[PDB]
């Protein structure tokens, strides 16, 4: 029954987000330094983000317990081909949104009906606010509710590849980002970033207050710029790798502009139609909370 000192569960060594590359294991901060980019002249301008709709879906009665956490990641950064998922037990979340409920949310990423014996879980009070915002992710494919899978991506590219000199004006030149690679590359970061404990992050966003939110956003604006990069190569138009003499570069076509089908096919992670609606519903919901 862990608690947060307002440092948050992210101020802990229990679960930390680390990519493995370079023959040893490294933190996200060290990785991003390799991403160097130029310009190709198609101005990607920051639009406004429309507020979400308050109505929460109903968690249709369900016996047993689903791994609510699993699906959140298994859709966003899921590597292995994921079939249609617009359907599913994806809104049991809202059953935590009400005041007095007994249903608890454990560590590891499960949603128990009744707290059982020997299972460590997040604090029942700070998991409430996380739900009154993310249980709203249940209606991701209901017509007349789904977000728009175009404009948010403009917001995304201004984040992982936008030098501050640009974001302060709200406009930037479309970039083509290439870092140096190894073998599997793009697919390897996916099989890696999947098992990260995303819930250990999102809970902090909706609780931690201005004192420990300005400090929280400063140490974690990088764990965000990591699960935002992989989520981006699932959109880019090309992945062709340039060649030096012995070196290899993974030029990525157009980060921040959204096409409709993956450049990866075989080389990188791939999305599906049912997932395009999903990524837009996540990316929209999370940005208001972050920004």
């Amino acid at each position: 029954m862990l608690q947060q000192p307002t440092g948050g569960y992210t101020t802990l060594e229990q679960f930390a987000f680390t990519i493995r590359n370079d023959g040893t294991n490294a933190t996200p901060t060290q990785f991003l330094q390799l991403l160097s980019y130029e310009a190709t002249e198609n101005e990607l301008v920051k639009k406004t983000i429309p507020t979400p709709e308050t109505h929460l879906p109903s968690a249709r009665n369900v016996p047993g317990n689903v791994y609510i956490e699993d699906a959140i990641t298994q859709a966003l950064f899921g590597i292995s081909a994921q079939n249609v998922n617009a359907h599913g037990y994806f809104s049991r979340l809202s059953a935590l949104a009400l005041p007095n409920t007994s249903a608890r949310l454990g560590l590891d990423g499960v949603i128990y009906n009744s707290e059982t014996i020997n299972i460590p879980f997040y604090d029942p009070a700070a998991v409430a606010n996380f739900a009154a915002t993310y249980a709203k992710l249940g209606n991701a494919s209901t017509p007349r509710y789904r977000a728009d899978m175009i404009d948010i991506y403009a917001h995304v590219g201004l984040e992982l590849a936008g030098t501050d000199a640009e974001r302060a004006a709200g406009v930037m030149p479309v970039k083509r980002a290439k870092f140096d690679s190894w073998e599997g590359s793009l697919i390897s970061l996916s099989r890696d970033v999947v098992n990260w404990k995303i819930l250990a992050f999102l809970i902090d966003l909706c609780s931690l207050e201005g004192e420990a939110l300005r400090a929280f956003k400063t140490r974690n604006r990088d764990v965000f710029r990591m699960m935002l990069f992989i989520m981006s190569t699932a959109v880019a138009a090309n992945v062709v790798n340039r060649k030096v003499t012995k070196r290899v570069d993974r030029v990525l076509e157009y980060i921040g502009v959204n096409s409709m089908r993956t450049a990866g096919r075989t080389a990188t992670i791939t999305y599906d139609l049912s997932r395009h609606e999903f990524a837009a519903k996540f990316l929209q919901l999370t940005f208001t909370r972050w920004n």
Partner: protein, 198 residues
């Protein structure tokens, strides 16, 4: 005067019957067995020899030919046991959420009223036992209010096809068209076509 036996208890028999309604699957079938034989013993109803549903006679006719076959492909056979099972299901407690043997019929001609009339007569001889299946029977009833005659369907669906009874009273119609499926029977969703609100 004393009997004398070990007094038949109220409790326990209620708990041991309740635990059996979670492990033992055929409990329901045994509860039916005891009170269905009572119906057949009281000699309340029994099937007859000949048939006489739709005639008033002088039928078999050329114009009737269409209406004749519509009622014929709806006729249930007077099986002694099938009759008793309907009278018994009316009172007996259930553990599985049963639903209707569904029919696919696009309401095309005036002779298709022989389907909506069946759902009327079923809702009278068995008013309970009609509550449980009220939603799945609603799903095949909306075709009668759309294809047969619209405008009302267009303004009724505008309000929505489902509501929640909560808010300590009142009704909360959700402005969206959805299907029933029966899987959401035991929750906070009442089929909105049976509301009564105008």
């Amino acid at each position: 005067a004393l009997r004398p036996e070990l007094a038949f208890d109220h409790d326990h028999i209620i708990r041991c019957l309740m635990l059996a309604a979670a492990n033992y699957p055929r409990l329901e079938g045994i509860i039916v067995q005891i009170n269905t034989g009572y119906v057949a013993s009281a000699n309340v109803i029994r099937p007859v020899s000949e048939k006489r549903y739709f005639p008033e006679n002088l039928e078999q006719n050329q114009s009737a030919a269409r209406l004749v076959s519509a009622v014929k492909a709806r006729a249930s056979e007077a099986d002694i046991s099938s009759i008793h099972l309907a009278i018994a299901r009316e009172v007996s407690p259930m553990f599985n959420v049963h639903e209707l043997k569904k029919i696919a019929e696009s309401f095309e001609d005036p002779s298709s009223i022989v389907v909506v009339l069946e759902f009327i007569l079923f809702a009278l001889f068995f008013p309970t036992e009609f509550n449980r299946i009220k939603g799945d029977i609603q799903n095949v009833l909306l075709l009668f209010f759309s294809r047969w005659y619209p405008v009302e369907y267009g303004i009724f669906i505008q309000r929505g096809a489902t509501y929640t009874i909560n808010a300590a009273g009142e009704f909360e119609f959700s402005g969206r068209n959805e299907k029933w499926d029966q899987s959401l029977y035991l929750s906070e969703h009442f089929p909105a076509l049976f509301s009564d609100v105008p």
